[PDB]
Design a protein around this ligand. Structure first.
Ligand SMILES: O=C1C=CC(=O)N1CCN1C(=O)C=CC1=O
Ligand SMILES: O=C1C=CC(=O)N1CCN1C(=O)C=CC1=O
Lengths: 418, 418, 418
């Protein structure tokens, strides 16, 4: 009944559904042809077909409804949008548009939408009355994003220690420093699982730029939520196009008072793609960086905020450091003072194969009093006076064994004193 | 048993085959996933498997057996060929090979061929004892190819005109010049049906480059022989890649003493693709083209010949004129006298809606005496003298009724005399 | 035993001769490498091997003895000559060098000449006693080349027309003007047969520039002399490389008092090739022809002369007109008042299937009184006074039938006066 529903429908049932109408030789045809044939079998008979997609506007008022499972890639299955649809209902990039799909006209290879039934998971008359995200008033992160799973496993301790190292709240524009071979991938999956566990209501999203497909498949199954990525073989134009429209989806949910969490890996690659896409300004930076190239990621990264009116937008990007590229240091420096949170994976402890390997002394955050309680920050203040005077390699080994024995971090906070 | 069987098989059989050895979740995943699963199912069990493909030689000696069905696009199913494999068994680009497939190693995403069974329908030892294509002795086309279908259909009437305008022999380097918007695509479709019916032994290959997918899909459904095509959506790097792959595969068939016919659409746009990929040389001719840019497309067009020792290589290409761009016009001027067969097309006939649409008086073939007989040529020559003073529009209108009122071209000549 | 014998040995026999030593898998290689491979078999045997070539001194100081059968292509069989070797015997480009060849040493990718047995069909010491070409005094041609076959055959009639239209003498810098499809190649084939038939003593060379591969092999099976060519698939620099090797080899034979005849097809193609190769001079004429580009082909065309010291140099270069390109028209405008004789072909006579299609009114030669006798020239003027009032086709038609009535032109002269 729904075009997107037929996409996930198993091919075994697709032939049976098509053959019930009276189709033929569906087994030999491709799955897309079977889906298109069912669209053809209802276009002639006048039967309405449902569907939905994410708006992807263009320069002439026309747009397409890209699919999340398609990584927002252009294709025949995308629902074409017309400039008239903007006149009927105010249209913005990243909008979730749902409605009955009309048959295409002559010369159109994409099925058009006769009318819109739902906008951003809500009625068009009510979704058009939402205040813009840019006109909102940002506020400091106050609602702490609890991450402690409490399972007692080794990976459970990882979520516990990140709360102790640098607390993360809703709308906190975080940032992490990743030296090569620091196990950054494992912690992100562990963090995402706790995100879906602790806060199933939030729209947890994962964005991967210039990443190998093996981790892309791993992210989709491990993360209990929508996962989008751009292949490492894709050109830089795809990387900037994917990332720009991802935040458009995130912003509309913020306009609908929905908490959004975006995991980015890596902002260094995203900045590198943006540098190669924009035209040269004539003034270059050290390491071969365009002057106005840094402006684009700032808008993307700077949007992460805890909106005072309602909802939040959290972006946790990954900074590539000590990777041997001169472009990596300049990107990190340009974003050094941008994020409200900093985490530094310890490569020295990584060579010791101790996971997680976090530089507790170097890592930290600002305005953590809002996230912490009256006594929560006091306990970690004592821990600050303990780990900092000594080395972090031995301290990380010390807390890992003690955190396993302790059930809760509050209970864990008591055992060092006694 | 064979990899190509898995690639071309209705999905219902793979579901049954997968469940035979206990493979599950077959309906949920895509068609290529179960193919990977079933192939890996035999990899663990040690069951013998087979495969085939068209060899693509890279700059390092490694290569992948590209698939003709996928327009020689990149894919996981391409069999990896090591640089030592081609040294153990002397192979070249475009060679059709088959054998047993070994499972990929860890860290390798492509299957490999441990042993080679057949090379272009021949043993690898016997195939390596074959004369190279370039060292052969080219000659004029002497074996006449019967273009007329003889069934009397409407498309047969179009076919009869070509025998009266420009006879085609084996290995003849033909050439078609045609302004757009004249139904050129369907005119070449009549050629494919005639050649396949009249000469099923000849390897009929059709290349479509830089065309809409609607015409690409129409070619496969209407041509019995192999068709390799790529749309203009792909970059020019694929255009040369899809053109170089086809001709090299065709060349090896000549070494196997087999006639091969290539139909190209279009050479004019093909040269532009070569004009873009070629690196800058510092000297640019008028119209934005480079002299070195036109060298390589000449080599592709110059490969057509009637080899005396055995086999042939017939190339028929269509040139685009009246496009309002100096890039296209300079190609026809450069490729003017290169082809033995020259068929002209005019929009004036196209406006008159006369099918076929060819400038009869100006079109002809050189060294046609080897193809036609003495009586046929004498009848042919008197036809040209009578048709010469008449205009292009009137010649076609006078000719169509004369051939329609008859059955065969030989019988058509009887009524012209009588 | 003999390198040049292996070069002319057919490739089918080359594989069989390679099995005499015991070497296998020579089929999947070029024709040049097969001779190179089998030479190494005899290199270890120590048997002296004979061979020859055409010297091409490189800019560094060494050179190679390119093979005429290889069309002066840079192949593995090119014998290397030390720069000191051209100091013992003063040699320049185009010298014919024959002698024994030593096996290559370690790291020597090319063979080497151990002894200079003969230079230009003479002793090496006698080679240094010949005056340079430019120091020779040019002179008007006076030794008539009797082009008439004398057998009264059908093809002899074409030679009868040419001798009646514009006599050719030793050193006559001819120029043939021909529109497309005017039966140009038929005339050149007819000329070449007559020259080798009537005058076997004079050295005959045929140069084909930008010619289809079908025609090159057709010519090599008819002309009883050296034939070199460069197909259009070869680069532009290859078009001028063979042309330089032809004139330089021709000049050396003039120094030894040998009449060398060069039939060129065509001067337009050679001029276009030279335009591409040479750098732009900043002064571009109409049609894209560089002003400084035409200095090189003129020198090639300007070498034809009747040297007073003995010998000559005859060049009959075909010119292309009405090709639809302004570049070809500019070239002809710079060679109009250059040739010693002209021969205009007419497409109109060709369309009437009258051969040879020679414009008798326009074609002619200058200072023809030196070639013919005072009475034969008087007879020729009678035909001039007859043809000139007539047309160009009817007079040509009148020429064909009257010439076919008799066997020799002097007999045709008798019947015209009666
Ligand atoms: O697109 C605009 C913007 C103003 C306007 O009148 N239109 C045309 C409306 N329109 C479509 O676009 C398709 C069918 C149809 O009636
Ligand atoms: O090869 C070069 C280049 C400059 C030079 O002096 N030489 C050596 C000359 N030389 C040979 O090579 C063999 C015998 C002989 O006298």
């Amino acid at each position: 009944m729904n075009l997107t529903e037929l996409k996930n429908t198993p091919v075994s049932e697709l032939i049976t559904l098509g053959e019930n109408m009276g189709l033929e030789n569906l087994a030999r045809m491709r799955k897309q042809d079977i889906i298109f044939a069912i669209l053809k079998q209802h276009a002639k008979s006048g039967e309405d077909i449902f569907g939905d997609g994410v708006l992807e506007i263009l320069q002439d008022g026309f747009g397409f409804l890209r699919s999340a499972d398609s990584s927002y890639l252009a294709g025949p299955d995308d629902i074409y949008v017309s400039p008239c649809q903007i006149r009927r209902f105010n249209l913005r990039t990243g909008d979730t548009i749902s409605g009955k799909i009309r048959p295409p006209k002559e010369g159109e290879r994409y099925f058009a939408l006769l009318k819109v039934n739902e906008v951003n998971f809500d009625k068009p008359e009510n979704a058009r009355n939402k205040i813009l995200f840019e006109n909102l008033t940002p506020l400091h992160a106050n609602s702490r994003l609890r991450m402690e799973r409490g399972n007692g496993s080794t990976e459970d301790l990882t979520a516990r220690v990140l709360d102790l190292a640098s607390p993360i709240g809703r709308g906190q524009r975080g940032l992490i420093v990743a030296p090569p071979k620091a196990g950054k991938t494992m912690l992100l999956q562990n963090i995402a699982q706790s995100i879906a566990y602790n806060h199933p209501d939030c729209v947890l999203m994962v964005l991967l730029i210039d990443e190998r497909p093996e981790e892309v498949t791993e992210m989709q199954r491990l993360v209990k939520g929508e996962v989008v990525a751009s292949t490492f073989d894709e050109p830089a134009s795809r990387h900037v196009q994917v990332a720009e429209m991802v935040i458009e989806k995130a912003k509309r949910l913020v306009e609908h008072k929905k908490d959004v969490i975006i995991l980015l890996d890596s902002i260094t690659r995203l900045a590198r793609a943006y540098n190669t896409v924009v035209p040269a300004s004539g003034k270059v930076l050290t390491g071969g960086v365009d002057a106005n190239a840094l402006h684009r990621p700032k808008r993307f990264f700077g949007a992460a905020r805890n909106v005072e009116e309602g909802g939040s937008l959290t972006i946790i990007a990954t900074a590539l450091i000590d990777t041997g590229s001169k472009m990596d240091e300049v990107i990190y420096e340009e974003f050094k003072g941008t994020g409200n949170m900093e985490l530094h994976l310890s490569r020295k402890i990584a060579e010791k194969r101790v996971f997680p390997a976090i530089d507790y002394n170097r890592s930290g955050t600002r305005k953590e009093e809002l996230l912490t309680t009256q006594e929560e920050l006091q306990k970690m203040w004592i821990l600050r006076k303990i780990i900092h005077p000594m080395g972090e390699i031995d301290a990380m080994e010390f807390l890992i064994n003690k955190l396993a024995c302790t059930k809760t971090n509050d209970d864990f906070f008591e055992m060092m004193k006694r």
